[PDB]
Amino acid sequence: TQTMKGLDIQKVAGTWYSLAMAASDISLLDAQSAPLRVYVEELKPTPEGDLEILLQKWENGECAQKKIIAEKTKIPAVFKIDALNENKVLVLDTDYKKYLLFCMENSAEPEQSLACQCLVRTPEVDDEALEKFDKALKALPMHIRLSFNPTQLEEQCHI
């Protein structure tokens, strides 16, 4: 468990770039159409305190815009993106203004499906953020890690 203490979810509002992403299984992130290959654009939290995510996911030969609600929980750094409320999104760490680390995990067999990202505010490769991402990662059963250059970060689906 790495989790962000004293997370003001309101301060994560706005634009983010999926600088890097890692997952427990290669097949979760290997191809463009892989199921956890998602690209965050914006985080819109509701006054309720729930969290709306605009993302892109490569879909029917097309980068597709998607909108998703992660529902809040008693834990402020932990949300539930609705399936059977099966998938938890945990915010591991953020400074609000440069980086944010999160992971998503399957409830049923956790290590079987776990993906995490290093989000940044700008399309620049932040060495500190990626350092922080790689040390949050040391402790986890990761088998695929991807990262993106500034050009790719300004393109839909990091293409």
Curated annotation (Swiss-Prot):
It comes from the Eukaryota. Disulfide bonds join C63-C157, C103-C116, C103-C118. GO terms for molecular function: identical protein binding; long-chain fatty acid binding; retinol binding. Gene3D superfamilies: 2.40.128.20. Keywords: Allergen, Disulfide bond, Milk protein, Retinol-binding, Secreted, Signal, Transport. GO terms for cellular component: extracellular region. The keyword Disulfide bond applies. CDD domains: lipocalin_beta-LG-like (cd19416). Alternate disulfide bonds occur in equal amounts in all variants examined. The keyword Signal applies. Its main location: secreted. Synthesized in mammary gland and secreted in milk. Pfam families: Lipocalin. It is found in: Secreted. InterPro entries: Blactoglobulin, Calycin, Lipocalin, Lipocalin_CS, Lipocln_cytosolic_FA-bd_dom. Belongs to the calycin superfamily. Lipocalin family. PANTHER family: GLYCODELIN (PTHR11430:SF117), LIPOCALIN (PTHR11430). Primary component of whey, it binds retinol and is probably involved in the transport of that molecule. Under physiological conditions beta-lactoglobulin exists as an equilibrium mixture of monomeric and dimeric forms. Interaction with LMBR1L which mediates the endocytosis of LGB has been observed in PubMed:17991420, but not in PubMed:23964685. This is Beta-lactoglobulin. It comes from Bos taurus. The lineage of its organism: Eukaryota, Metazoa, Chordata, Craniata, Vertebrata.
